[PDB]
Antibody
Framework: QVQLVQSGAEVVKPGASVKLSCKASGYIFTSYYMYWVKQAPGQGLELIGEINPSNGDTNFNEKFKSKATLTVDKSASTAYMELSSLRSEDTAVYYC???????????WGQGTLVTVSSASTKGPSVFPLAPTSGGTAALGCLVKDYFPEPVTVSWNSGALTSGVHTFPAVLQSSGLYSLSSVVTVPSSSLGTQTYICNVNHKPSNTKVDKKVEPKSDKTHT | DIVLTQSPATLSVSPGERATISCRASQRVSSSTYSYMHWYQQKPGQPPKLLIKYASNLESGVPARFSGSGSGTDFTLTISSVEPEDFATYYCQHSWEXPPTFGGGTKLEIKRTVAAPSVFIFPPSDEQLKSGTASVVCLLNNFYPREAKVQWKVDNALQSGNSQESVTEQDSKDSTYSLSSTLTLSKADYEKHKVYACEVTHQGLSSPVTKSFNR
């Protein structure tokens, strides 16, 4: 398998720089051109530029030739993009992608969200949404009080995906984000199956697992 | 630069119907022999994905129901029979000359059958309440279409603020939406009341439906 793996989401202070990386594997790194592509939030696609990793020849979309520096480390199979003196308009998901011959882009990185802000990064708290309707039960994790985006959630390290709904973040009054991820399962098997939500907030390096157990009390004091 | 103009911006199709989306280049992007237009699919949350290269070459592993045609400036992507997992934005891209440019995207939306929400309610975790705050989450699961009205009632009184909603994109397997509505109160406020209720109105339902708990 061919794979491009990008560095984590990051907050960058206005006027600062940031260096994104893209690690290639499952093919010979210098045999394919690498493109960088920008996707503004809720927006379409813009080409930043192209690097030939064999001979270092670059070609920039003129619009970005003062913003972006493309390099590679051939010994380590990794393309880099340095973005200089960031402003609000640089807030976007940045993708690396490969191309055999500078036409179609056949394999893509998963993207890096760069958020330009003066506000501090903050990791989320994770709270259980403990488990009915037509014999099904709902359960979930509330992922609260983080900045910037994104948070990702998986269930049972990726084994549980059917019925999962991981909501778009909402922006709270505090300026911190919030999101919930929920699943529906059989109510019948709540005592036999285990449901663990895996919450990732790369900018704060938060990587947290939370067992969501059934709500199991006669005494009220 | 070359401008790619996609149309329509949004396409709605029923389950299993044909979808056609157009991409017009502002100038020619074909030789005598080959076309330099490519098509991508961006599923929600994921990077774009190569479907069709050189106007009509189906990329490997891409399902057979996808196809492409045209030459010169006018290019079309056809989905012969739309499945739930085809919910995506589709982008065209040329590689005729520097710089390659993308189209603006066509959002493909799926007009599946009407479905009422199953509604659930979650009181705050004990864990959260230790910290001084209470989130109560109301879940509307697997409904279609999108319009749904959610209202919070605390001791039967309509709450005016202190809640936030978020709806999912159309689900990749069944094309429905889900919605969370979270009511955030301080621990004190939360504890000064008994009944927490969420009242849901949706066109697949003939009455409002109420889920609640007493604490």
């Amino acid at each position: 398998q061919v794979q491009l793996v990008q560095s984590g989401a990051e907050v960058v202070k206005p006027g600062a720089s940031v260096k994104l990386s893209c690690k290639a594997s499952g093919y010979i790194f210098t045999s394919y051109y690498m493109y960088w592509v920008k996707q503004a939030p809720g927006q379409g696609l813009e080409l930043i530029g192209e690097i030939n990793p064999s001979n270092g020849d670059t070609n920039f979309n003129e619009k970005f030739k003062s913003k972006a520096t493309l390099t590679v480390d051939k010994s380590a199979s990794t393309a880099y993009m340095e973005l200089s003196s960031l402003r609000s308009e640089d807030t976007a998901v940045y993708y690396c992608t490969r191309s055999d011959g500078r036409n179609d882009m056949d394999s893509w990185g998963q993207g890096t969200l760069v958020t330009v802000s003066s506000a501090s990064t903050k990791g989320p708290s994770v709270f259980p949404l403990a488990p009915t309707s037509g014999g099904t039960a709902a359960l979930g994790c509330l992922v609260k009080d983080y900045f910037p985006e994104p948070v990702t959630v998986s269930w049972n390290s990726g084994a549980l995906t059917s019925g999962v709904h991981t909501f778009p973040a909402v922006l709270q009054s505090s300026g911190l984000y919030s999101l919930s991820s929920v699943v529906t399962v059989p109510s019948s098997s709540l005592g036999t199956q285990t449901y663990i939500c895996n919450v990732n907030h790369k900018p704060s390096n938060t990587k947290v697992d939370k067992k969501v157990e059934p709500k199991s009390d006669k005494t009220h004091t | 630069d070359i401008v790619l103009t996609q149309s329509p911006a949004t396409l709605s199709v029923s389950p299993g119907e044909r979808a056609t989306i157009s991409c017009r280049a502002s100038q020619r992007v074909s030789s005598s022999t080959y076309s330099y237009m490519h098509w991508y699919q961006q599923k929600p949350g994921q990077p774009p994905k190569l479907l069709i290269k050189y106007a009509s070459n189906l990329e490997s592993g891409v399902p057979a129901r996808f196809s492409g045609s045209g030459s010169g400036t006018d290019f079309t992507l056809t989905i012969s029979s739309v499945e739930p997992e085809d919910f995506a934005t589709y982008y065209c891209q040329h590689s005729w000359e520097x710089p390659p440019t993308f189209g603006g995207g066509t959002k493909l939306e799926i007009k599946r059958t009407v479905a009422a929400p199953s509604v659930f309610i979650f009181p705050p975790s004990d864990e959260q309440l230790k910290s001084g705050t209470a989130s109560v989450v109301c879940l509307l699961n697997n409904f279609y279409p999108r319009e749904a009205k959610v209202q919070w009632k605390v001791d039967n009184a309509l709450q005016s603020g202190n809640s936030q909603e978020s709806v999912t994109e159309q689900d990749s397997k069944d094309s429905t939406y889900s919605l969370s509505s979270t009511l955030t109160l301080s621990k004190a406020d939360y504890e000064k009341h008994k009944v927490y209720a969420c009242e849901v109105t949706h066109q697949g339902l003939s009455s409002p439906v109420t889920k609640s708990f007493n604490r």
